[PDB]
Subunit: 109 residues, 3 copies
């Protein structure tokens, strides 16, 4: 078959450490809010806070799910994330491997 | 003058660095892509036959013309060890024109 | 949240020293809310008919889409390479409070 552009998205989420990242990744995949999560360790986050530059050690999550599920995914991550304001941003997938994209929709449907 | 979306960023997951490098080199050699960024030590968590699984992998970020994503995907699945290779591409809307221009020329 | 009003831009640098210098500067000048540094990247590209493999650092920058042009000019002015890699992708969804924060600090 084909693929509807933008029907699948990749969401990025930053976590304070590997333990937290793994906990949320397993939960969202089990709850079928996502089909796949890639964890990238050893990240350093830089931003301004209280008039000073902060450099933190974090883990970055790349989450592949149905674009229509991102709101629910964001609600879940927000409810269990240790941060008061968790970074969750999602980008639409326009092209790719159809059987893979088809799989993302099925296991999350 | 960059045409929004004419260049795309594609993400591919490989089992190990050896495979990632072979595919990455072939892709640039064959001009299906201008550049490939390999991110080692990735942990993937996904479903498989109803059960949750965890694998150690390498993530590839490939930049190329959006028009070439289909050819790139076909090639990646031809030599990728997995049955269903992860290949997703996101459109680039803005950036550094000279670089975006270069991506176009080498592919 | 207005779809596409925030973007994530990627920039690669030769080492963590340059990446951090550029990251701290864009945040300081409020050209971006935050930057995530991904260390130990291997870049494979062609140049002069040969395949190169360099060790590098990847930067993921979150800012207002309207700020990408300025962010790009600044990066190009302080970046060590002649032709710096800077590509931006629009954010269509996400956690509204985080997205609004990005707009606020920039």
């Amino acid at each position: 078959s084909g693929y509807v552009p933008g029907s699948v998205s990749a969401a990025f989420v930053t976590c304070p450490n590997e333990k937290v990242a793994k906990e949320i990744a397993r939960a969202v995949v089990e709850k079928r809010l996502a089909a796949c999560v890639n964890l990238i360790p050893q990240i350093t986050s830089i931003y301004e806070w209280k008039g000073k530059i902060e450099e933190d050690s974090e883990v970055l999550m790349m989450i592949k799910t149905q674009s229509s599920l991102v709101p629910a995914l964001t609600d879940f991550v927000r409810s269990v994330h240790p941060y008061e304001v968790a970074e969750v941003i999602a980008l639409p997938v326009e092209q790719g491997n159809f059987p893979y994209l088809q799989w993302v929709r099925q296991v999350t449907e």
